[PDB]
Amino acid sequence: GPLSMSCWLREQTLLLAEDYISFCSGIQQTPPSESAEAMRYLAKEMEQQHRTKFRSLSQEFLDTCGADPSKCLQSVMRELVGDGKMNWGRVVSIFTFTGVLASELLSRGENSEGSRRLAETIADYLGGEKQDWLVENGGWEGFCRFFH
Amino acid sequence: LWAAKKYGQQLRRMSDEFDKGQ
């Protein structure tokens, strides 16, 4: 059912977000899944292509958000897709931005708990709010094949 | 124009460029 699928998509997304965030946090481990290998490559490609802008955005974000970065990230994700359209490129940017955000929070002395909250925010949004789009596009296996 | 919309639009434009190269 829709609830069963959403729960599964949320967990699949959480694993993916947790892996990318860890990858951005100095941890070196083999990708746990083909989708993780793909996201590591694609999200770092997007960062390398816009590194200064992502860095500036992450610092502005954290300086204007305050107490709850996860809540602020939900509002950004909502505005990113605020034109009703959804595609894998926008998903990649969410991962790229959150990876830079996580790295900046670590640089500022924060614990890994904040990282986990950001991963759960991505998972809840894509696996819950965007479950229909994710399913119709084949989920993270479709993400893999779309980018060959 | 407020922060969340500013950041969302910035990410949108970078996503569009990523699609142009893919």
Author numbering:
A (entry chain A): 1 to 148
B (entry chain B): 3 to 24
Paper lines:
NRZ is a 19 kDa protein expressed in the epiboly of the extra-maternal yolk syncytial layer (YSL) of zebrafish eggs. In vivo, NRZ has been shown to be a potent inhibitor of apoptosis after serum withdrawal, and controls development during somatogenesis and gastrulation. Similar to other pro-survival Bcl-2 proteins, NRZ adopts a conserved Bcl-2-like fold consisting of eight α-helices that form a globular helical bundle. Our findings suggest that NRZ is a unique pro-survival Bcl-2 protein with an unusual pro-apoptotic Bcl-2 binding profile unlike its counterparts in mammalian systems.
